[PDB]
Design a protein around this nucleic acid. Structure first.
Lengths: 177, 47, 256, 283, 47, 256, 71
RNA sequence: AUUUUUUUUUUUUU
RNA sequence: AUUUUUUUUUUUUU
């Protein structure tokens, strides 16, 4: 109900099987991406094109283990509702270990060459989700939730044109010193 | 592939001129990789 | 030499069509279909080329040509959406591009008279039968292999079905600027039109967008000899050509 | 003809031709092949050597689509805004979604083709009028702000969106024109005059209208404050295409248009083919 | 047979320039003869 | 260098599998899968290679590993018969050949104990549970992605389900002559087996014949730490490799 | 990408990439190093040779801050 | 698994 | 539509 540090933490439950960790649409000028440094410069421009770079960092105990599957659904199909649906798209299986980050790029899967940064149905980008590949196993004498940290950036493939004014700020009266 | 001809400056000051143009410098590495040891892609990041 | 312009053979896959009273083949805008080159491409995914299983002749259902019959319209790739491996890749993929070879059959005798206008129209956007800002609903622009019978009735959410006004407000006589071919029963029994991929994008969704539409229109009415049955069959056989599919996923669901 | 080009006088129109008694007949054809044979007058009659003193330059599609045409007429006024809830309904400001299919005369010239790609040249003319009693003619300035999709839309005439730190805007005087160039801003490689498709696979989505022929939108206002009187400013937008490329020549439309982006035509419309005043054999 | 001298572009953008001019390409054959077998004039069209 | 034998990546199509506690990859009989060469080929039809749409990782349903759990068996290409474009070409064609990359997931903690035997068996002909000349019916050798749970009950027309006797009369210890790989929870969490096409014919029907069978067998029983849930998930992900399809027709109907 | 610039058509967007079964994993990273690894789509999927017909000129800070605004 | 695409020249039907 | 496969050498990641 109010903005928190907890808003950056994707909860991750232990001993769960075939469930879903997160899910969102890929309108990068709205939603979860709106206040992000990518998606605050994206709203300074009307058109965007290129590949996104999505990261996830696991912050559980070092004696814990998990396998997660991060999938991108290209546009045309709905948002996937089980793991087998998301398994048919652009996906990676992430083994959690000594290297704590997976980097799963969202590649440019589009017929038209440019997408509107404002959300548009014709130039929609698709869907993004994560699922349990096997489970989360916690070590003994550790209880509770562990967390994920999601990152987004742009590839060097990224394009951005037709500068506009953004919707993230406004004022009703001028400011005084 | 034409070239514009508007390269004649009419005033004596350098502040009076038009915009400088694109830098074509384009180095993201001082924000994306500000690390001391060079980190290859494909190699493990640690050890 | 000693061959004929009349006797033709088209072979595509495990399918072969022969004709012996053809006229020519029409190649749309003097251009054979091709695969998407790297210079025009935008999508980074490696495309799928299933060629033998999908670039083959599929025979649509037959249409009865009567004296009072107006004409038939078919949308591509919508007509080939339940046809084998091609229609399956059409739904399992988000993108796709295709060229076509269309071969329309209508044989008769030397006592018969009549003439058909077989025409391929790129981006044949249909008009609603109510006018104003009324749109045409999805299922009426996607009939499948059954096509649109233009001699049928007006129905709610559907297109107008006046064969004269071409379902878009332009007259039927000026429809010869599009790649066309006649079937004249005294001369012709088949028409061959080869279509490349015509779009303003390098590759497009094959379920929400029909690139071309095929119209078989009787210009001169059918005249059978005395005592003959007042009917001829018309058969349409379309083969995909240089077909690519990109962005495979879990089979999007279309209305109905 | 355009076959042979001479040196003394170039591009002959008809070649010199004589009597024929031959087994090759150029005038017998099959149009069931879908082709137009290039039959000249010298294949039927006896001709003389004439030249084309003509290049075919006004029928170039750069020239054909490249003159300024009125694409929109909108109206704003400069009155007291105190006590007005909706500034758009009171026409203190007015915006327009940019399209070239509202004047039917340019629309028919455009819809001779399926795909067109061009840079746009806009010329905006603003003329004022005071229909009520006034002591003077106001010296007014019009702002035309080019608003891309996804940009914040103005709610009031004095609203914060008119400052336009990113959106391009022009400030010009009433009675004058503002001329500016806008590049080709289609998402695809060409605009779509016609679209046999939908935005997505839905049973209730709209047919034909698309963002493939989306050209932005421009919003209008008067920068000046209110006077004692009310002054109506009429704004006419003129579009000139340039660097035009066009594809897929279509049949010309003869029935009248009813909407924007639709190919719909009115029910119970009049016949467009002229009926003969007589029979078929009548000149 | 004079030549115009207005070839100096004042702005930096290619959209800012004037009209392109006549193509002098002039190929009616892809609409008038879009056929697979070449069809001579004088010869019979069929067989 | 500085890389690992533990950290592996397999990329096939638009699918990518990473692992960080692997052991190796097993390549069956030291042979990578290939397409059918012209010298070995007999069928005259041009084959279809749909590679991007079909040679990609398909994830099967997950299996619960309990202490009393016996093992699971999967038949190929039968397990991938409803999986996207591959399963569609499997039914629309009369012939077909395929290699596979099989990746079996089972992660745990360092307090866990247990060991799985992942083995690929060519021509794993099953024994009936009644003996004599009783055969196994079609639906019990074609379960799909669900596979055969070997800890289930005896059912009429089905195979025997004793994990010791390998469902064919040979003991489980000598099953390591087949291409195999262990998953030991102290060492391993994945197993990779790459299968070529193993048949006595150049190309075969993919619906009436399973070329290989994949068995995941717990040798050492599962020991969770004290208070842990007595369960681990096992996931199987199979990708076709160098897949050809020949003799396209109108989708044969199989039982059920 | 912006790594290699060709002659026939310059500044490729994605290089052509095939299947990987390798011990080097470009997609496994530590962001505890404070760095963003330049991971391309060709490190995760199979790609095709595409070109950037784009220079990145409107996102220049001369252009970004260089239009008139009401202060 | 050091494979994928760009495209060259030769062979089978011209 | 004079296209299809067999396979060579070069380029992108070794």
């Amino acid at each position: 109900t109010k903005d928190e540090v907890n808003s950056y933490l994707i909860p991750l439950n232990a001993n769960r099987q075939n469930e879903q960790v997160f899910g969102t649409n890929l309108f990068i000028g709205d939603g979860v991406f709106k206040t992000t440094l990518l998606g605050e410069i994206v709203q300074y421009y009307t058109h965007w094109s290129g590949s996104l770079r999505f990261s996830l960092m696991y912050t559980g105990p070092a004696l814990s283990s998990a396998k997660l599957i991060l999938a991108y659904t290209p546009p045309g199909a709905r948002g996937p509702q089980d793991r087998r649906e998301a398994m048919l798209g652009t996906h990676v299986v992430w083994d959690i270990g000594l290297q704590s980050t997976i980097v799963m790029t969202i590649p440019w899967t589009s017929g038209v060459q440019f997408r509107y940064t404002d959300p548009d149905t014709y130039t929609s980008a698709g869907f993004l989700s994560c699922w349990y590949q096997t489970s989360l196993i916690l070590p003994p004498e550790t209880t509770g939730q562990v967390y994920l940290l999601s990152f987004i950036s742009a590839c060097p493939d990224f394009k951005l044109r037709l500068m506009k004014d953004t919707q993230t700020i406004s004022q009703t009266v001028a400011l005084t010193e | 592939s034409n070239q514009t001809f508007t390269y004649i400056n009419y005033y004596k000051d350098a502040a009076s001129t038009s915009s400088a143009g694109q830098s074509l410098s384009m180095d993201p590495s001082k924000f994306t990789e500000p690390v001391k040891d060079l980190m290859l892609k494909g190699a493990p990041a640690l050890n | 030499c000693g061959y004929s312009d009349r006797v033709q053979q088209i072979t595509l896959g495990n399918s072969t069509i022969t004709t012996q009273e053809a006229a020519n083949a029409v190649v749309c805008y003097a251009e054979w279909p091709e695969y998407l080159p790297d210079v025009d491409a935008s999508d980074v995914n490696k495309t799928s080329k299933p060629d033998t299983s999908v670039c083959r002749f599929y025979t649509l259902d037959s249409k009865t040509w009567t004296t009072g019959s107006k004409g038939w319209c078919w949308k591509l790739p919508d007509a080939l959406k339940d046809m084998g491996v091609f229609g399956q890749n059409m739904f399992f993929h988000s993108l796709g591009r295709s060229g076509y070879t269309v071969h329309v059959q209508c044989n008769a005798t030397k006592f018969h008279s009549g003439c058909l206008l077989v025409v391929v129209i790129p981006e044949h956007q249909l008009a609603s039968h109510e006018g104003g800002n009324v749109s045409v609903k999805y299922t009426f622009t996607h009939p499948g292999e059954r096509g649109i019978d233009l001699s049928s009735a007006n129905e709610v959410g559907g297109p107008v079905k006046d064969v004269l006004y071409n379902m878009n407000g332009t007259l039927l006589g000026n429809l010869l600027i599009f790649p066309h071919q006649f079937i004249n029963l005294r001369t012709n029994n088949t028409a061959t039109i080869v279509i490349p991929y015509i779009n303003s994008v390098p590759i497009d969704s094959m379920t929400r967008h029909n690139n071309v539409s095929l119209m078989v229109i009787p210009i001169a009415p059918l005249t059978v000899p005395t005592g003959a049955t007042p009917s001829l069959p018309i058969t349409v056989t379309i083969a995909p050509m240089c077909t690519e599919f990109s962005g495979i996923r879990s089979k999007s669901i279309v209305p109905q | 003809e355009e076959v042979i080009v001479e040196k003394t006088k170039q591009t002959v129109a008809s070649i010199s031709s004589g009597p024929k008694h031959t087994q090759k007949v150029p005038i017998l054809t099959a149009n069931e092949t879908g082709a137009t044979m290039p039959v000249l007058p010298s294949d039927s009659i006896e001709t003389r050597t004439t030249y084309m003193h003509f290049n075919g330059s006004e029928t170039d599609v750069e020239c054909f689509l490249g003159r300024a045409a009125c694409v929109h007429v909108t109206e704003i006024q400069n009155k007291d805004a105190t006590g007005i809830d909706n500034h758009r309904e009171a026409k203190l400001f007015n915006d327009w979604k940019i399209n070239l299919s509202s004047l039917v005369q340019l629309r028919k010239k455009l819809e001779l083709f399926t795909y067109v790609r061009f840079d746009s040249e806009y010329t905006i003319l603003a003329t004022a009028s005071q229909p009520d009693s006034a002591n003077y003619s106001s010296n007014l300035v019009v702002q035309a702000m080019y608003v891309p999709p996804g940009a914040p839309n103005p709610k009031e005439w004095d609203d914060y969106t008119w400052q336009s730190a990113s959106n391009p805007s022009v400030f010009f005087k009433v009675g004058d024109t503002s001329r500016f160039s806008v590049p080709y801003v289609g998402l695809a490689s060409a605009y779509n005059c016609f679209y046999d498709g939908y935005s997505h696979d839905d049973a209730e989505t709209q047919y034909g209208i698309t963002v493939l022929n989306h050209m932005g939108s421009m919003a209008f206002r008067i920068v000046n404050e209110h006077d004692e009187h009310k002054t109506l400013v009429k704004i006419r937008v003129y579009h000139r295409a340039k660097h035009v490329e066009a594809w897929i020549p279509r049949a010309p439309r003869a029935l009248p248009y009813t909407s924007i982006g639709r190919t719909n035509y009115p029910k119970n419309t009049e016949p467009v083919i002229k009926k003969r005043k007589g029979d078929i054999k009548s000149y």
